[PDB]
Structures are given as structure tokens and as C-alpha cells.
A paper describes a structure:
Also, WDR9(2) and EP300 exclusively interacted with the triply modified H3 pT3K4acK9ac peptide. The WDR9(2) interaction with H3K14ac showed strong dependence on S10 and T11 phosphorylation as well as acetylation at K18.
Residue numbers in the entry: 1317 to 1423
The structure:
Amino acid sequence: NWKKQCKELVNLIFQCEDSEPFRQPVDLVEYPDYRDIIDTPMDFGTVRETLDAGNYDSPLEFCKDIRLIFSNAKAYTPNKRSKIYSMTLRLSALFEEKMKKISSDFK
């Protein structure tokens, strides 16, 4: 059951300290130029909601949206000295480790 596996992984991510800036959509009052840089916003709350609505056709679609969270974060704050950049690298690494098993069990 890939859907329950992906749900467990999203719940795991919400418990990770590094996910805090990615739990909700980026706020456009706080970051007014965000959408001049980012075409397709994404966050873990949205991913959770999409999964619960049954609106991912496969784990690859789920993964693509999670990868988008990280690519967006790195695009908007590209300075590798920044806290957010390091939090993105660490959380990305954990996610990819976990997603590997889900993707195998599927294929």
C-alpha cells in the first residue's frame, strides 16, 4: 500500500525539525517577490491534503511534489551559507532515503 507508506512518510516529515519552514505555503506578505522566482509553490500540508483526497495517481507524483518543495527552497534562497539551505539539504537527504523503499515496493 504505497498510499499508506507515503502518508507515513509525510507524518514522519512533519515530526522532523527541518520541515518547520515547509509545513504551510510560503506567505506572500512576508516574501512579496516569491512568485517572481517560483512558478509552482508547494508545501507538506498541501502534499498531505492531496494524498488524503486521493489525488496522487502514483508515488512518483507524490515524490515530484516533495522534490518541488526542496527545489523551490533552494531556488528562492540559493545562498549555501543560509540556515534554510542546510535544513533543505538535510531533510532532502532523509526524504530520498525513505522514498527509495517506497519506489522499489511499487516497481
